[PDB]
Every structure is written in structure tokens, then in C-alpha cells.
Amino acid sequence: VVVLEAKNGNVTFDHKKHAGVKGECKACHETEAGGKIAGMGKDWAHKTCTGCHKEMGKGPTKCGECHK
Numbered sequence: 362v363v364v365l366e367a368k369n370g371n372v373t374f375d376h377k378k379h380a381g382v383k384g385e386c387k388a389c390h391e392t393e394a395g396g397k398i399a400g401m402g403k404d405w406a407h408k409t410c411t412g413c414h415k416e417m418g419k420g421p422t423k424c425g426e427c428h429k
């Protein structure tokens with residue numbers, strides 16, 4: 362898994378749970394190959410991560426559901 366560090370509690374990101382989303386890899390990455398995400402941080406996460414969870418009605422939307 363990927364551990365996205367945060368001073369209020371790290372967030373654990375699992376690619377397995379994120380297969381079969383619109384755009385597939387390009388939902389989060391510039392390319393189909395993937396890689397590190399230079400823009401990663403609070404602004405990125407609270408837009409893109411939370412945004413999709415709300416759009417799909419699936420996944421964590423409250424602070425402590427991500428930050429542990």
C-alpha cells in the first residue's frame with residue numbers, strides 16, 4: 362500500500378480498491394503508466410480523493426475515515 366503522510370494521521374491508499382474507476386489510471390495520474398504525483402498534498406487530496414468518493418457514494422468522506 363501507499364502511505365500518504367499527514368501530521369493529523371497518515372492516509373493509506375490501496376490501488377486494489379481503486380481499479381474500475383472512470384479514467385482508470387488517469388483518474389489520478391497524468392499517464393497510463395502511473396508514477397509519483399508531484400502535486401500530492403492537502404489541496405490535491407481534498408479535491409480529487411474526496412471529490413470522487415462523493416461522486417460515487419463510496420469511500421471515505423470524513424476526516425478520520427482517511428486520517429488515522
Ligand code: HEM
Pocket residue numbers: 363374376379380382385386387388389390393394395396397398399401
Ligand atoms: C491501473 C492504473 C494505475 C497504474 C498503472 C498506477 C501506477 C502507479 C505507480 C507506478 C505508482 C508509483 C509507485 C512508486 O513509485 O512507489 C503509483 C502511485 C500512486 N498512485 Fe497509482 N496507478 C494506477 C491507478 C491509480 C488510481 C486510479 C489512483 C487514484 C484513485 C492512484 C493513486 C496513486 C497514488 C496516490 C500514488 C502515490 C503517489 C505518490 O506518493 O506520489 N493510482 N501508481
Ligand code: HEM
Pocket residue numbers: 365366367368369372401402403406407410411414421422423424425426427428
Ligand atoms: C474535514 C476533514 C479533514 C481534515 C480536517 C483534514 C486535514 C488535513 C490536513 C491538516 C492535511 C495536511 C497534513 C500535512 O501536511 O501534514 C491533510 C492532507 C491530506 N488529507 Fe485530509 N483532512 C480531512 C479530510 C480528508 C479526507 C476525507 C481524506 C481522504 C479522502 C483526506 C486525505 C488527505 C490526504 C491524502 C492528504 C495529503 C497527505 C500527503 O500528501 O502526504 N483528508 N488533511
Ligand code: HEM
Pocket residue numbers: 372373374378379382383388389406409410411413414417419420421426427
Ligand atoms: C489519493 C486520493 C484517494 C485516497 C487517499 C482514497 C482513499 C480511499 C480509501 C482509504 C478507501 C477505503 C476506505 C476503507 O477501507 O475504510 C477508498 C475507497 C474507494 N475509493 Fe478512494 N481514495 C482516493 C481517490 C479516489 C478516486 C479519485 C476515486 C474515483 C475516481 C476513488 C474511488 C473509490 C471507491 C469507488 C472506493 C470504494 C472501493 C470498494 O469498496 O471496492 N477514490 N478510497
